[PDB]
Amino acid sequence: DQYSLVASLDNVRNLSTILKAIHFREHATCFATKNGIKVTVENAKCVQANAFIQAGIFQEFKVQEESVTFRINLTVLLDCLSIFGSSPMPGTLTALRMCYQGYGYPLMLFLEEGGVVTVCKINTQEPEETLDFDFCSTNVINKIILQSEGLREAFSELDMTSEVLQITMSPDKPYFRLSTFGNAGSSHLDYPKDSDLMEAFHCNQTQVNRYKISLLKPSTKALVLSCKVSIRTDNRGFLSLQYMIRNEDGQICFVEYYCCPDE
């Protein structure tokens, strides 16, 4: 069995859920290593979303090389992972066995629910240039962590009319502000540094950056599933959003969103 990659899960949802958090592009690059899998989707040099599932999440996880990489159709991949329905019942799990022989071979999925077995042969492609946003904690001007739960309603009410979203972070008031500028309408969303939602606040300077809102819109998927989110901008003005997601087995996984500023 010369399989570059082999993975198994008693619960596909410990993979499909995370992958849905970054599903805004039809294609994604998969990077596997002894430590786990990283799926990446990019929006033409402006946005990058990464989901990482540590090897510890799987029941079986082995890579026969230093690293293995391939491109796949994320949409098809997610369609297959939920081949048995998206409203499973308590005690009703769909197990998964992933196998990727090697360069030039299709990704193989084996899923079973109640004894019914689905076999999927998803062709793989040659990876492409994957952007690099080196958000070093040494480049981070301001950093903040919010309680995801209480931001969902508010974040979905961001005036999509405005073409930009302006973020303000500062040791002075307002502490954290999201602003839009749509049809005959200026709007602001303010979060005080002493908020119950504010679990961590580390802004040591006043920064005001703008971003094209539609580029940030897909970051909502990850927000909904997360329970925490840290927000960071660097000296270049790039935005970094890190979501902490807890799977059904209490384990923790992260999703990361990077976005270049608007000028």
Partner: protein, 269 residues
């Protein structure tokens, strides 16, 4: 002087009928209602992709009052073509109904008029009346509204849980609209889609076969039509049989609560 007048006064019956109506409203935009002294059939013989649907109700299991007169004593039947959603919208409030009356009328023009007498605590109940436009089908056209002949199936197999099948073909449809369905006498049934960049096969087993080599009988079909049939079934039927005629057609035969439903899906191209 053809005529039809029926009434339903039983709650469970009123709901059963409503469910059946909601079902055909799913399987076909337009259908033909055949009325006989003892039955009521909903018929769809849309030939394209000549998929056909034959539903049959035993009048006595629903109506406490039933009366009709065909076109002539010799051929004592009536065939009315109607828009399915029309009949469903009419049964919309039957949940809180005391009684239901159906009657072929001709006020402004031929209609199947449905009157829903709503539940009430007084002597005067609220009444909902719906005039459903129908087109009477002439005897000459009755020939193309007979239930399809059932050529003996190469394989006849019990179907798996329909909800599960629905989910699977739902997702497969997102990948392709062509589907191969195959089964054998060993209780195995597979759903399969093959495209250039992705293949998916779902294996159902231990399904059982009805009494009377293990190579499978298969047939390529329009997935959208299979989805349609499954989408229509609101609940897993008492008896659900899949009959396949290798490379020619799949025939579904369901029997849920004395109401049979025969769906026919022909092979592709």
């Amino acid at each position: 002087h053809m005529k039809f007048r029926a009434k339903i006064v039983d709650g469970a019956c009123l709901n059963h009928f409503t469910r059946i109506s909601n079902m055909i409203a799913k399987l076909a935009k337009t259908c033909t209602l055949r009325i006989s002294p003892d039955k009521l059939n909903f018929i769809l013989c849309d030939k394209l992709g000549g998929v056909s649907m034959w539903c049959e109700l035993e009048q006595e299991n629903f109506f406490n009052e039933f009366q009709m007169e065909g076109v002539s004593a010799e051929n004592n039947e009536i065939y009315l073509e109607l828009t399915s959603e029309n009949l469903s919208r009419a049964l919309k409030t039957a949940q809180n109904a005391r009684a239901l009356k159906i009657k072929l009328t001709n006020k402004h023009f031929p209609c199947l008029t449905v009157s829903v007498e709503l539940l009430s605590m007084s002597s005067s109940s609220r009444i909902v009346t719906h005039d459903i436009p129908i087109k009477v089908i002439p005897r000459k056209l009755w020939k193309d509204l007979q239930e399809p002949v059932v050529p003996d199936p190469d394989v006849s197999i019990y179907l798996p849980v329909l909800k599960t099948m629905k989910s699977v073909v739902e997702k497969m449809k997102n990948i392709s609209n062509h589907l191969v369905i195959e089964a054998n006498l060993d209780g195995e049934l597979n759903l399969k889609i093959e495209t250039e960049l992705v293949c998916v096969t779902t294996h159902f087993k231990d399904l059982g076969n009805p009494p009377l080599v293990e190579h499978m009988a298969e047939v390529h079909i329009d997935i959208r039509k299979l989805l349609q049939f499954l989408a229509g079934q609101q609940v897993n039927p008492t008896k659900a049989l899949c009959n396949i005629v290798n490379n020619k057609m799949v025939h579904f035969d369901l029997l849920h609560e004395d109401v049979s439903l025969q769906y026919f899906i022909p092979a592709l191209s």
